Amino acid sequence: GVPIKVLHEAEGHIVTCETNTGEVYRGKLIEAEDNMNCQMSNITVTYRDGRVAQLEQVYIRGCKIRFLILPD
């Protein structure tokens, strides 16, 4: 479909989100908005220096996203 529709179909699935500054957020996509801002939960984040940590919920704006890795 159109990229945004593909993103909406990943709602409920695990997605990987790589930001423009190199942070990697991986977790369950709860909701993507029209501008690709994504609400994710139970995430695992890899920061720029390689530090790995976890967070219960994050809100990643679409303008901060390099790419998203979706299921299938």
Added chain:
Amino acid sequence: SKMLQHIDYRMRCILQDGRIFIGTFKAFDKHMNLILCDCDEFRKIKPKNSKQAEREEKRVLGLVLLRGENLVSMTVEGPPP
């Protein structure tokens, strides 16, 4: 742009920093956000140390939604699989 013709073909999508996303082009939009299936990212890195040679990194990604704001160039890499 004229991109509906390129659907299902293998494309080389280059970001402003030179990262090269190679995948099967499945979707796009006015902002240039792309859907690239069976996608890999390639980077060519030139070390700060001048006695070391340029090196390469490859990451196998999969089904990728690539944001158009960073996309600067797109070339045909090969026909549709």
